[PDB]
Structure formats: C-alpha cells, structure tokens
Design a binder for this molecule. Structure first.
Ligand code: F9F
Ligand code: 0JO
Ligand code: BZI
Ligand code: BZI
Ligand code: CS
Ligand code: CS
Lengths: 267, 393
C-alpha cells in the first residue's frame, strides 16, 4: 500500500516519481546506508535496491561492477535484509522495491523469501529473469505476503502480454525503454504512448520507465509522455564508482544529481 | 503459451528476461515448421552427408580390451568436419537462422569446438559470426581461436568471473538481449531456456540413430550400455535419445570430477549440486548455501560448466540414466591409453567417457559387456595442454 499512497500523493501534486537504483552494500554496508539516506534526503520518491548476485544477466558493466564491489565487502543476502530493516526503521513511508534474480528467491524456498520481505517491510519484488509465463509461484507467494510482484512491459509487448502484466502485477508496471541490459550510455526511447495508454485502459499499476534514463531531460520526457515516473540506476552507480576514494564528494554529487532528476519529474 | 513442452519433469522452462520471450517463441515456431518441411530436411541431410561427412565410423577397439570380456566400440564424432559433434546441430541452427531472416550469429564457446562449428557454418551459409570465449579458455584451447579467426569470426575474450565457459555464456546472453532483432543466438549445448534443449537433442539425435544401426550390423544386438561425457548435455543426449525406449540399454553420463569431488573443484552438478535457476533454466547447479552460482573446474574446458541440461536431470531423477564422475587424472590416463594403443587422439572431454568405460572393464574384467563410448571430438586442441602436464611430471 506504500506505492498506492505514493502515487495518490504525486497525482494530487501533479508530479512524477523519481526512483533511483543502487546495489545494497556497494561499496560497503556503512557507506551504502549513507548513500541511501542521501538519495532519500535529495528527493527520491521510492527506492529500487539490488541484492548482489553472482551472475546478473540483465545488467551491463556498471551494475555488474557494483555487484562485485558488494561481494568484495563480503555482502550476503542476509546482510541485505539487516540493511533493509535499518532503512525501513528510519523511513516508514518510502516504497522499497528489490531487484532480485530468480535463484536467490527460489533458493531454499519461494514462500520463505517473500515472508522475509514482508517481515522487513519491503513493498515490491522484481524478479528479473522470471517472465510472466514462469511467474505463477512467485506472484502467488508475493501476494500472500502483501508484496507487490513487479512485471516488465517491453517495447514490443503484444496485447496478450499487456493484459497479463495489468492483471498479475501490483505497485507499479516497469516500462522498459529499450532492449538490451542496464546501462547509462545506451539511452533508448521515449515511453511508447500506445503502451502507456493500453496499460491505463487495462487498469495496470502506474508505469515507471527504466533502462538508460541518465539525464533530467529524459525524466521530464517520461512524465510528459504519461508515465508515472522514471527509474535511474547506472547513472547513480557511476557516481559511486567515480568517487570511491572520496566518500564525501560521492554523497555531494549524488545529492546534486538526484535533486536535479527529481526536479525534472515536476515538469 | 508454447507449442512444445518446455519441461522435463521439474526441470527446464524459460527463465529469461521478458524482452527475450518473443525471440524464443519465434525460434520454437520456426523449428516446429522446419521439422515438417521436407525441403529443410533435405538441405540439412545434404550438409550433414556431403559437407560434414556423416555417417561417422563406429570403431571396434580391440587392443585396449585385451584379456577382458568387454567389447568396446567408439562412435567417431571426432571424424566430423570441424573435429567434434558440435558441427551437427550448428548446421541445423544456422539453417533455422536463415529461415528466420537473421544475418548475424552469437555463440559462446569453451573448448572452442562450438566456436569453430559456428564460424565454419557462418562462413558457408553467409552469416556474420561473433563468439564469446573465456580468457582462460582462449589460452588453454588456443588452436581453436586461430581456426575461428581464420574463418572470419570475431572472437571476444571474456575476463569476468572464472574467465571460462559460464562467463562466456553470460556475455552471449547479455548480447542477445540487445541484438535479437538481427542476431540468432546459436546456443551450443542441450541446456538453456526452451526451446534449446529440445532443438539441440533433435539436431544431435543422428549420433544414437547411426550407432544403433551400426551396432546391429556388427553385433546383431543392442549395446549393454552407451557412455558419453556431459558438459551441458548435447553429445550425451544425441547418443542417448534413440535408445531411451530400449529399456535394456544402459545410459551412462560422465561429469567432470576435476581435482576430486571432495575438493569442490569439479563440474558435476547433476550428482553433487542442488536444483536452481540460472542460464534460462531450472536445473541442478553448483551453488553456495545462499544461492550464488559457484565457479566450476575441469582440466577440460568443454566440461567446465556449473550446470547441466534439464533432460539429463530428468533422466537421472527417474533412474533411466545413471551419472558418474571422472577426475582430471583419470581422464589424462584414458587420453594417453587411446593415443598409444588405438592411434586415436581424443578430446579431453571425450577422454572422461573413455576413462569410465575403461574402469567398467578393469573393475570387472570377466563381466561380459558390449559398450559404446561416444568419442565426441578429436584432441588436437588439447595436445599442448597435455604435453605441458606430462612434461611437468
Ligand atoms: O539506469 P539503468 O540503465 O542502469 O537501468 C536501471 C535498471 N535497474 S532496475 O533495478 O530497475 C532493473 C529492472 C529490470 C531489470 O531486468 C529486467 F528488465 F529484465 F527485469 C534489471 C534492472
Ligand atoms: C563447450 C564446448 N565443448 C564441449 C564439448 C563437449 C561437452 O559438451 P556437451 O555436453 O554439450 O556435449 C564434449 N565433447 C567435445 C569435443 C566438446 O567440445 C565448446 O566447444 O564450446
Ligand atoms: C506445456 C506443456 C505441455 C505441452 N505440450 C505442448 N505444448 C505444451 C505446453
Ligand atoms: C556447456 C555450456 C555451454 C556450452 N556451449 C557449448 N557447449 C556447452 C557446454
Ligand atoms: Cs572379448
Ligand atoms: Cs558440467
């Protein structure tokens, strides 16, 4: 219900959402926590948070490297859940979404995974390598534990897929900007207006555009096109990567960037 | 919705990002169409016979079984053009790529035999080929890198992770997720998302069909067992498929034991891993307690992968096939034995299958048994590796 409340508030203020992604525990647990506090203070409307995985097949080099940094700091899924408890304790209302790979959810039990999510106060889970066709046990477990299962609407989505995503998903619909893997340098396209309008027709959860969104201009364009907001990952992670040696400058640059991206969502 | 069953019992499926589902459905539809198309079948048969050199020999090896009651035949996929069984299904998938109007091929390779097969088929049929290969494999299977490049393929070293086959697979799939409109992903084993385990089986099954006909000709009966190494599963399922319904025929798959199962440095997930989801499939995996995918190890680059095709996981679960492991040292001994006593230099991958057959014979030398080992490839690519080991000894 944290998403429902957020989108209602943004609608009332005629604003779009800006949603940063980072990898949990990159470049360490303590610095990660401070990074996330900075994203929120700078105006993030929600968070997408990655649990480090050995083989992230939807991610390009920037986020691959974030995963590696987290592993070098010895980050495990259990520590991620510890971090999530701390974030939720400080920030009661912000929607928190996890970006998961299937094996980490399926490992020792789908139901148990979503139960841990509910216990810690996560709001949604996007399992990147589970298409709607394989989704049944994941989405069922999610709903039983009051977690929103997030589904992807790709650019070339047919009508059958639009109907399934609208029916099965909750929280938000992930509107994929382009084919390929995550990455800031590969920009992608404007929200296909036809997809945005079809999802609305079918009463889908509000659409957030993601992949290759790296500039305020692209955030504005997403909202103007009728999306409820935008997600940016690689652009944020690049600021981490660039500033590993100066954690103070890291936070200042993250604050400035997130501030600007959020401003663009008010356009 | 699919046309064919994506699962083998619990195992298999299509665990890819949503973006790729249309590509997999298009490939499935093209395969189903092609399987009914006499012109496609005739083209494929013609390439297999007149270009690749099928049917391959079945060789009786009667020096290495002297003094025992074992009769051993070798199915000679090492004699296929390119030097391994990989050539068979690449010719079929290349024709499917053309059928679908694709101009480009992406492939992964470990031993470099799938890479060479992909490159040669692309040269013949007019496709642009790019091949991902782990940087450790670029070094240990270097003859194949030279062959791929001479045939005009782009070979891309992958330095990530273990810098071996898993890492090459990862990069190939990431590429395809952005390039599928113009590129076909020529997956080189009976694993990954549906429909690949099914396509690869159906385009390798001539191995077992020929074996059956040849052994009936020579021996007047079926083998007691057929034995094949398992990297992802293609040469083994190609050998097994035509015998699955012949209930008397044992089906034995050989996983790499590496430095020994007890060391954790192996590639034997069927027997020593745990079901997981990775590389588009639900299958046995080498994984940590927390569900991270582990790095595999084998002396053989072609077996060095931490998972296995779902049809093998299924055949194991129901007890129709048995799976065993062979260590690096065992494989090396079988390599040396075949070179010196039969005058055939086998791939180190295939040497794992031979090593298990030699153990079946030596452990029970008065047991009457008629065995076939799939000699999946030739060992030219491995001679520098093997030389350097025997020298260090
Ligand atoms: O800004 P970028 O280009 O780094 O993209 C940010 C993406 N981060 S995320 O967690 O939304 C995200 C969402 C979906 C992903 O894969 C899937 F689409 F297949 F499901 C991967 C990452
Ligand atoms: C990984 C590769 N080869 C595997 C291989 C294998 C193992 O792969 P399959 O389990 O798919 O047969 C067996 N025999 C030979 C000669 C091989 O080259 C490759 O060539 O890329
Ligand atoms: C799922 C299961 C079995 C099937 N047989 C044909 N299509 C199928 C899909
Ligand atoms: C295992 C995994 C991937 C492969 N590609 C070609 N042969 C393989 C074996
Ligand atoms: Cs004999
Ligand atoms: Cs293996």
């Amino acid at each position: 219900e944290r998403y429902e409340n957020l989108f209602a508030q943004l609608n009332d203020r005629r604003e779009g959402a800006f949603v940063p992604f980072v990898t949990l525990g990159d470049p360490g647990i303590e610095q990660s926590l401070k990074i996330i506090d900075t994203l929120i203070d700078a105006g993030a409307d929600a968070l997408e948070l990655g649990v480090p995985f050995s083989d992230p097949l939807a991610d390009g080099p920037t986020i691959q490297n974030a995963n590696l940094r987290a592993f070098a700091a010895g980050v495990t899924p259990a520590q991620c859940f510890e971090m999530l408890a701390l974030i939720r304790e400080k920030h009661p209302t912000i929607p928190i979404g996890l970006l998961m790979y299937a094996n980490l959810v399926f490992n020792n039990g789908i139901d148990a995974f979503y139960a841990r999510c509910e216990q810690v106060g996560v709001d949604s889970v996007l399992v990147a390598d589970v298409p709607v066709e394989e989704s049944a046990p994941f989405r069922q477990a999610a709903l039983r534990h009051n977690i929103a299962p997030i589904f992807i609407c790709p650019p070339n989505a047919d009508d059958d897929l639009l109907r399934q995503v609208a029916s099965y998903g909750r929280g938000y619909t992930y509107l994929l900007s382009r084919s390929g893997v995550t990455g800031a340098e590969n920009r992608g396209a404007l929200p296909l207006h036809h997809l945005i309008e079809k999802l609305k027709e079918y009463h889908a959860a509000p659409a957030l555009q993601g992949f290759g969104i790296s500039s305020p201009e692209q955030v504005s364009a997403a909202v103007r096109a009728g999306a409820a907001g935008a997600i940016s990952g690689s652009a944020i992670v690049k600021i981490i990567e660039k500033n590993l040696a100066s954690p103070k400058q890291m936070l200042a640059e993250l604050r400035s960037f997130v501030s600007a991206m959020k401003a663009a969502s008010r356009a | 919705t699919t046309l064919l069953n994506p699962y083998f019992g619990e195992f298999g499926g299509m665990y890819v990002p949503q973006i790729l589902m249309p590509a997999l459905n298009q490939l499935e539809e093209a395969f189903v169409s092609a399987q009914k198309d006499p012109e496609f079948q005739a083209q494929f048969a013609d390439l297999l016979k007149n270009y690749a050199g099928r049917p391959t020999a079945l060789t009786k090896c009667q020096n290495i079984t002297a003094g025992t009651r074992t009769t051993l035949y070798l199915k000679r996929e090492d004699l296929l053009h390119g030097g391994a069984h990989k050539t068979n299904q690449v010719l079929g998938q290349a024709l499917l790529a053309k059928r679908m109007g694709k101009s480009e091929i992406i492939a992964e390779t470990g031993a470099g035999q799938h890479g060479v097969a992909s490159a040669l088929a692309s040269a013949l049929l007019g496709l642009k080929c790019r091949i991902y290969m782990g940087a450790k494999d670029v070094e240990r299977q270097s003859p194949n890198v030279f062959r791929m490049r001479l045939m005009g393929a782009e070979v891309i070293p992958v330095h990530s992770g273990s810098a071996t086959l898993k890492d090459a697979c990862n990069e190939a799939l990431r590429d395809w997720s952005g390039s599928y409109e113009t590129a076909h992903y020529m997956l080189g084993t009976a694993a990954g998302p549906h429909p690949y385990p099914t396509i690869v089986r159906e385009f390798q099954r001539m191995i077992g069909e020929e074996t059956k006909a040849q052994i009936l000709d020579k021996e007047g009966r079926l083998p007691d067992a057929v034995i094949a190494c398992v990297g992802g599963g293609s040469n083994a399922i190609g050998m097994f498929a035509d015998f699955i319904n012949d209930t008397s025929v044992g089906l034995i798959g050989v996983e790499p034991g590496g430095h020994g199962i007890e060391t954790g440095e192996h590639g034997a997930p069927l027997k020593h891993g745990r079901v997981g989801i990775y590389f588009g499939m639900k299958a046995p995996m080498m994984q940590t307690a927390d569900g991270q995918i582990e790095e595999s190890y084998s002396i053989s680059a072609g077996l060095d992968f931490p998972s296995v095709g779902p049809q093998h996981a299924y055949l194991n679960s129901i007890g129709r096939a048995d799976y065993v492991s062979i260590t690096d040292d065992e494989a090396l001994e079988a390599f040396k034995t075949l070179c010196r006593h039969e005058g055939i230099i086998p791939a180190l991958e295939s040497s794992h299958a031979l090593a298990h057959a030699l153990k079946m014979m030596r452990e029970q030398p008065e047991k009457e048994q008629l065995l076939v080992v799939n000699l999946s490839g030739r060992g030219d690519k491995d001679i520098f590796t093997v030389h350097d080991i025997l020298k260090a000894r």
